[PDB]
Amino acid sequence: GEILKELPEGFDKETVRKQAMEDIEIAQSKDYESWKSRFTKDLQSSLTEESYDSYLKILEKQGEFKEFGKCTYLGQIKDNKKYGGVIIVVKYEEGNVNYSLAYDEDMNLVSFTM
């Protein structure tokens, strides 16, 4: 379906900003199956360690997380399923890594990028 640039009906700006903040900080500390628990149960089998290994190569020269900056919100549809996203800036000590965390209404992450 359509992949919106914003939250349509069935989501919340406060809840969606928060459901990304956590997910970032669980990725930071190289959590494997604790970070899988953020994704869909299907995606827990689809996750790579490369998703938190190549990621670490970026992170290691960004500094430590200081604050969450500007948060864009996003939408998606699969067929009948609606999905809520967020491009939430992270002010690391040296880098803005603007993590894009998109998930279903059931609240299981479906599309994490940075």
Side-chain angles (χ1 to χ4, degrees), residues 7-44:
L7 299 185
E9 304 181 294
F11 313 106
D12 187 78
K13 298 188 68 177
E14 302 300 284
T15 304
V16 169
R17 188 262 187 167
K18 181 177 58 185
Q19 215 299 265
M21 298 201 307
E22 306 168 279
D23 300 60
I24 295 165
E25 300 167 290
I26 302 166
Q28 292 178 212
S29 190
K30 46 83 187 65
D31 294 69
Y32 320 135
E33 304 197 75
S34 309
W35 191 62
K36 279 166 55 280
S37 301
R38 283 297 167 144
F39 286 72
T40 86
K41 286 179 64 183
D42 180 88
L43 288 190
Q44 301 192 28

